[PDB]
Amino acid sequence: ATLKEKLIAPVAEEEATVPNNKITVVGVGQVGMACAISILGKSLADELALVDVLEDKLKGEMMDLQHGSLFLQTPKIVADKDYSVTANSKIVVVTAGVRQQEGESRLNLVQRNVNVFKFIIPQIVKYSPDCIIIVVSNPVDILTYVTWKLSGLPKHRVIGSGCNLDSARFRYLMAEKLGIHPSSCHGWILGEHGDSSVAVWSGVNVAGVSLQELNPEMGTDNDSENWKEVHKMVVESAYEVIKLKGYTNWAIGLSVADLIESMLKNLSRIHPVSTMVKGMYGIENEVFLSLPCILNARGLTSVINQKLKDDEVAQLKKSADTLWDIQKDLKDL
Amino acid sequence: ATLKEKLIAPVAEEEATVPNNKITVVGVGQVGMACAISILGKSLADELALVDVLEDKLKGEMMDLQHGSLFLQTPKIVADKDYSVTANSKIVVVTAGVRQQEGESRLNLVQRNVNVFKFIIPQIVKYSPDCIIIVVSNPVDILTYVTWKLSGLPKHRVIGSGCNLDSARFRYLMAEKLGIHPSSCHGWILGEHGDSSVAVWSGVNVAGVSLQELNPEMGTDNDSENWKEVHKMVVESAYEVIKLKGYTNWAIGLSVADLIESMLKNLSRIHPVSTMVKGMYGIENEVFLSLPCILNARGLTSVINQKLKDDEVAQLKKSADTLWDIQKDLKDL
Amino acid sequence: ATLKEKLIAPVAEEEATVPNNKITVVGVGQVGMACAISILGKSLADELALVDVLEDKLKGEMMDLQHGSLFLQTPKIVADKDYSVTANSKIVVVTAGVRQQEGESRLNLVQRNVNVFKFIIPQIVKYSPDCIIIVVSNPVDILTYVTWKLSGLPKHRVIGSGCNLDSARFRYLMAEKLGIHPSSCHGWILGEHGDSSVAVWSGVNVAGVSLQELNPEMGTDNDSENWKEVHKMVVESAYEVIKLKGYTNWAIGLSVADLIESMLKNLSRIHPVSTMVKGMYGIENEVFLSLPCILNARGLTSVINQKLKDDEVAQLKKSADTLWDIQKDLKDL
Amino acid sequence: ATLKEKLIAPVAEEEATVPNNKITVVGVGQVGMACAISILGKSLADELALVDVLEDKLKGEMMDLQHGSLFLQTPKIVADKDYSVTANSKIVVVTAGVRQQEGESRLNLVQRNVNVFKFIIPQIVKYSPDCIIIVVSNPVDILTYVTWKLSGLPKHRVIGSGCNLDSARFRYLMAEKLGIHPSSCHGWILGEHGDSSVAVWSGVNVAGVSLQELNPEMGTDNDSENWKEVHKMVVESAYEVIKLKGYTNWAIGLSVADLIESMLKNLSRIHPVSTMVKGMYGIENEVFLSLPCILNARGLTSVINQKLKDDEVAQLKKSADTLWDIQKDLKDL
Ligand SMILES: NC(=O)C1=CN([C@@H]2O[C@H](COP(=O)(O)OP(=O)(O)OC[C@H]3O[C@@H](n4cnc5c(N)ncnc54)[C@H](O)[C@@H]3O)[C@@H](O)[C@H]2O)C=CC1
Ligand SMILES: NC(=O)C1=CN([C@@H]2O[C@H](COP(=O)(O)OP(=O)(O)OC[C@H]3O[C@@H](n4cnc5c(N)ncnc54)[C@H](O)[C@@H]3O)[C@@H](O)[C@H]2O)C=CC1
Ligand SMILES: NC(=O)C1=CN([C@@H]2O[C@H](COP(=O)(O)OP(=O)(O)OC[C@H]3O[C@@H](n4cnc5c(N)ncnc54)[C@H](O)[C@@H]3O)[C@@H](O)[C@H]2O)C=CC1
Ligand SMILES: NC(=O)C1=CN([C@@H]2O[C@H](COP(=O)(O)OP(=O)(O)OC[C@H]3O[C@@H](n4cnc5c(N)ncnc54)[C@H](O)[C@@H]3O)[C@@H](O)[C@H]2O)C=CC1
Ligand SMILES: c1ccc(CNCCc2c(CNC3CCCCCC3)[nH]c3ccccc23)cc1
Ligand SMILES: c1ccc(CNCCc2c(CNC3CCCCCC3)[nH]c3ccccc23)cc1
């Protein structure tokens, strides 16, 4: 009778399909939408759900993505302020809450964003008890800890985007100096995604050539080439971009899509992401900060043990102390 | 104690992989390996299993693929003569059996390849009772029927690669004449993957312009442009390529990867593939042949009802009669 | 002496890059950045230049993209307010200018954006005399005409993004009703990217089945299924999304990346884009509006002639009249 | 008058198109066709030309690829025994000649394959004087030297596929031991693509952790974990695969596509490929062997200088001496 009934003959009985690689993005602001477009561009989701408290903005973002469906391979894009829309997600990316004002530390956002997370996180696990949560909201290390405590998920299923972005920036800036692709320039930023991050100069290399072996002063204040300035540029990068355009989003969206790719393709690639590091490098408390971690379909399955220089371990311990001083006073977790 | 124990600190205490996007290719001949490399190139499997009777060849192919892992996103590639290696496959591609000699009809392979399938199909469903089977071995329409009977699987989970390849050839040949990309030149080959195929000239179009409306003689024997010769070239293509290089493999490997993409990405794209067409176009028996079908993560869920011209319906019925003449005499299914 | 001199031994004594697959995006607003991220995600440029009048915002966007380099395959990302940065671009995407307020016609933007284009287009061709220009700013059909006049380029090198986006929206909405992928649901929106667009109901098809042959009332006011409402939703879509989120950007960014892919891959795929249609369907003036066009590495090399129904031709002529009424009064082009 | 003339209205004059990223594959054997399918799969060629002395096999391979065009983004696939078909190639991949029989050294193929190259290489440069040549035929290091002498091309435009494959195998075997993706396991095989290859144990690392710092005996005969066996497995791999399936092809096809991607995308990624190493590591003659090299659109533009252990330098010099002993006895280059 209907055009659809004239055109389409069933072979199978119409039955509810459960998606196999659903992704939710919580928060459809600058970061959440950069994450969404990068996930859709890399064909990483068979279903994409969006949540926000701004109902009109949310519906607009959902419709704009839906209009691009012809160019994508994501057959279902949905959005609602209600967390029921997020059911059966494999990965939930949390970008909701407040961002830095100009010259504001990420650590100054802690009380506001803890209050946002207190109501969101229990709803995420209610509807997707088997998900991995990727925390992006700042300060990302503290809010990964908070998400672990609120969610009751195992450690391997609560990941902070952490220093995957800082390390991308570091590798870009070193690769630009050397005239090579960042993928061929190896270097790790660890610890806090923020001012106390640690540059592991001792592991920086190109084709397995230690650059600190070529320039032993690399990373010190007594270096005629002032490589230390590259780590200062990594630390200052968010502040500089926020002064120019108000926020950052494109690089973090690609960084989050890189983490999702490793997990949904089950690759066991190593990324510097935020995890619980008690018992590593003499850290005595449940600090979350970035170390090199193996990521696959289970989540964050292992941490790489490193031989660090004394000044590197000292900076990592200082970063841990900086974060623990905030974590220890958090209430009702 | 081991280097691995020194380097890698567990976060998850468990290392077992849950079966997920596993594909098996049965047969490691020219077609099975083209299927395998196209599945790996398009990142369509997290686990690829190869099964075949030829143990040395199978191990060599497995090792050669494993050596390219750095360039791929498939973390597990395995191979064995025993079907236990195929356990918990979501899709199984069947390419094993005899192939055409020069000038040989695909229909002449039926007794030999039915005997191969009486062995193989029960082993597939023993180890993957919840799989989708894509049949590629020839004659593909008859062997799709045979696989359906032997497997006990529902219709929507047994698919013959069918005329997805014939249609690709048809679109290439018409697009070459018009100077456009085959993706912009729409045309359907239906029925037997073989000599009795149907060119649906009444549906051939560019930008929704019916080419038969522009040239009503298109596909008739009274056409000065002789468009009918294009269908003759589609029918003869396998024989011409077999005469020149001995077999065909690259285009069918890409065609199979196209079908898998629609299913694993859950897209509900329409392909001309082999399904059970009883009750369509006056067909009274359980004939399998190619019609436009919707493919998604459930398998083959719908068929498109078409308005055909009399000469199109007549060739489709002739195709069904040709195939049923062989099907009706099959024993012990 | 330097770490770079210690590490890197020249084989080639020269480092300059020969200009090749360079793309400029003019405008770093919502649309320019969606275009930029989609071009980078699809690896469509070896060099991306951003040009804009807002120097701080431009530098911030350039830095944010640069920080994602590790995740991309574009080795050079540059930005300046001076058009010297755009030199030797193969493709220039123009997204600069004013956009619609809530409820505002795209045609109300004409005087403002003609003033923008009178500055921008001469600067583009000064620095890239051999480029293809893709016009995105609204009203896109009028500004494609203005760009043709100001640039002195041949017709095949000046393209309006046009109805590629309207057609994607149309195919999304029809595919959603039928439960299929938009890539399997064929349908064309022609004429103005705006209120006077034409839905070619006579060409709408699935697997070469004309849907108007199944439902002759499709696209008329006397249709119990009211398929006409789908064309109304296409026309209203920009206004609805602007009401909800303030602007549109994701779908047009993907649409522009689709056009660039056809051209840089030299594919001769057909897209409904804005071109000079004098002499077509009795149009007597140099009107620009969308028809199905072949796109390849030369640009826009052909238009598809269509057999249209009387109501489709009537709307196309009305669309042409609507645009010519504005074009005829333009001065100093 | 013709259907094409009714359907397609010219905007531009029909003009001969010069491809911008044409690739030729010389030899359509097991390696040449693995190269071709990997190039087509990664969308690296707007035109693909095939050359072989076997005219029928060549035409059949061309047709089988053409039949897959709908699934590809390569609008022109051509093939001929005449090198005029290769004109205006950016990259020419040479796979032609004889391969190893079972247990045969690659070095034993040198006189036969030099005789093939003496005829081929002058014709390649005649028709594509601006190309990069990637040598794959064995013994690859000596034939890269021979191709340099015969071609008269600059060093940076003559590249041997070299140890890109050996290093992929090495990284796969180490990554399998550690349970990580090969892309996260860093290790270099240098020198001859063959029995005298050098494992740079001192540069092997995961996340910038030197594995030889964890196990100082790594690569010695006095190692309880016998990591040296992994290098033996790399050396023996081609022989083992040749014993099982007769040849190798899939891994080298993906390795060649990786080198092409770096060059056509202008990335300046580092690969261990065969280049002229006179003046490096006390090598006094025009030896070609693999070192880490930067690859971009210019070709092989730099070599990475490494700090190697004494035993590693000794092995590299022994590899150079092994290759020079063959190069010095070659006639009429
Ligand atoms: N980890 C990293 O590397 C980076 C983190 N960030 C962080 O990402 C977060 C988001 O930044 P933007 O997207 O630029 O901010 P934004 O202001 O553009 O968007 C934030 C969104 O969160 C929504 N939201 C607020 N409260 C909510 C609640 N209770 N439930 C649901 N949605 C809620 C808002 O309505 C808004 O749409 C910030 O915390 C920022 O500091 C930003 C850049 C990089
Ligand atoms: N549906 C389509 O469009 C196409 C179908 N084909 C069909 O694909 C099949 C495979 O072709 P190729 O790979 O070229 O053949 P091939 O000879 O290269 O490989 C045949 C494979 O099946 C195995 N096999 C052969 N005889 C067997 C037996 N008696 N029992 C168990 N395993 C056996 C072999 O060990 C080998 O792995 C043929 O039936 C051929 O007609 C070929 C091309 C296109
Ligand atoms: N063709 C299509 O399908 C679509 C077209 N558009 C059009 O794209 C254009 C850009 O929209 P958005 O990016 O959302 O706007 P936006 O306000 O976010 O960005 C506009 C950009 O143009 C620059 N610009 C503004 N006024 C200028 C002037 N007087 N001179 C020079 N540069 C100037 C701004 O600095 C900024 O870079 C608008 O004309 C809009 O109507 C919007 C969406 C889809
Ligand atoms: N560098 C590497 O890592 C690897 C190198 N190889 C080498 O690749 C080469 C090709 O191996 P396969 O493809 O397996 O051999 P194959 O025997 O399958 O194909 C070689 C092709 O070269 C053609 N040919 C012979 N002389 C020719 C000439 N004068 N002009 C044009 N074409 C000519 C033959 O007709 C044949 O089609 C061998 O030298 C082999 O050792 C193989 C694997 C990996
Ligand atoms: C002679 C001696 C040593 C070599 C090979 N050098 C490999 C050494 C190496 C380092 C340096 N590790 C530092 C060393 C100081 C102790 C504290 C921190 C760890 N980083 C890498 C990153 C990647 C690869 C290797 C390395 C060659 C010749
Ligand atoms: C019997 C008669 C005819 C057929 C199949 N006919 C397919 C025809 C067709 C149309 C309809 N064209 C219109 C109709 C006339 C009004 C003026 C404009 C042109 N659109 C398509 C889009 C795609 C493919 C085909 C078509 C089958 C059986």
Author numbering:
A (entry chain C), B (entry chain B), C (entry chain D), D (entry chain A): 2 to 334
Sentences from the paper on this structure:
Lactate dehydrogenase (LDH) catalyses the conversion of pyruvate to lactate and NADH to NAD+; it has two isoforms, LDHA and LDHB. LDHA is a promising target for cancer therapy, whereas LDHB is necessary for basal autophagy and cancer cell proliferation in oxidative and glycolytic cancer cells. To investigate the binding site, we solved the two crystal structures of LDHB, that is, the binary complex with the cofactor NADH and the quaternary complex with NADH using the substrate analogue oxamate and the inhibitor AXKO-0046 at 1.80 and 1.55 Å resolution, respectively. Both structures exhibited α/β protein folding conserved in the LDHA and LDHB structures, as previously reported. As a result, we identified a small-molecule LDHB selective inhibitor AXKO-0046, an indole derivative.
The crystal structure of the quaternary complex of LDHB with NADH, oxamate, and AXKO-0046 revealed that AXKO-0046 was an allosteric inhibitor distant from the catalytic site. AXKO-0046 was located in an interfacial allosteric site between two monomers, approximately more than 20 Å away from the active site. Electron density was visible for NADH and oxamate at the cofactor- and substrate-binding sites, respectively, whereas relatively weak but distinct electron density was visible for AXKO-0046 at the interface between the two monomers. These results indicated that the compound had alternative conformations on the two-fold axis of the tetramer with relatively low occupancies. The indole ring thus occupied the small cavity composed of Gly204, Asn206, Gly209, and Ser211. In addition, the NH group of indole formed a hydrogen bond with the main-chain oxygen of Ser203. Two NH groups of benzylamine and cycloheptylamine interacted with the side-chain oxygens of two Glu214 residues. The benzyl and cycloheptyl groups were exposed to the solvent region and surrounded by Lys308 and Lys310, followed by the C-terminal helix with significant structural rearrangements. In the quaternary complex, oxamate was bound near the NADH nicotinamide moiety and interacted with the active-site loop (residues Glu101–Leu110), which was in a closed conformation. The substantial conformational changes in the active-site loop, accompanied by the conformational shift in the C-terminal helix, were associated with the binding site of AXKO-0046. These results suggested that substrate binding mediated the forging of the allosteric binding site and facilitated the specific binding of AXKO-0046.
